[PDB]
Amino acid sequence: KGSSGKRVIHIGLPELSEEQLIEIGELAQETIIDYVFDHLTRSEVKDIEVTMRINREETLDLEIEVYLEVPIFVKVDVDKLIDEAVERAYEIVERKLREIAN
Amino acid sequence: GSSGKRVIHIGLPELSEEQLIEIGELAQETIIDYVFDHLTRSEVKDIEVTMRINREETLDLEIEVYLEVPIFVKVDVDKLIDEAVERAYEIVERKLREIANE
């Protein structure tokens, strides 16, 4: 089992139309996916799992859970890579939200 | 009767690992779109759609769907999930033929 790691980006959501809700969810997830494959070659990625989660209780919450695993012979720092991927996702979603707020 | 779970395994041998990501995304999002186009926002208490890409240890793509509606809402969750999934296959198959043609 090569290096692996998981992270969950969690975002409280404001008032959004259905179209904007789906757009935001997909944006968050694709930013993470694209980030991974813009730094790794398809061969270095043994397993990538991504879950989009939208929970609506007292508050509207979006969560993107990502798990990544590389071959045991690949030397990339998976945790740091996932961290940065997730960070990029947070800022891109947070900006898109401010933009919508107008 | 307030929730449903569904796991589908998909093999896509004629596609490169990159096109696998694209299809995984098409599949997952077709399912998300379907759920929100057929249920009101308030009826979707919790939805989770996972895409797993792993050509070396699985058929290739795995999609996991989890859907929950409020306990007082009368909806056939497995049925809705079934329809969402079938729609996904139909859309994925069209994409595959499209890709094959190019």
Automatic annotation (TrEMBL), chain B:
- Check the record and name the InterPro entries matching this protein: DUF3194, MTH677-like_sf
Q: Which family does it belong to?
A: Belongs to the UPF0440 family.
> Gene3D superfamilies under this entry?
MTH677-like
This protein's source sits in the domain of life called: Archaea
List the protein's name.
DUF3194 domain-containing protein
Organism field: Thermococcus onnurineus (strain NA1)
A Pfam short name? DUF3194
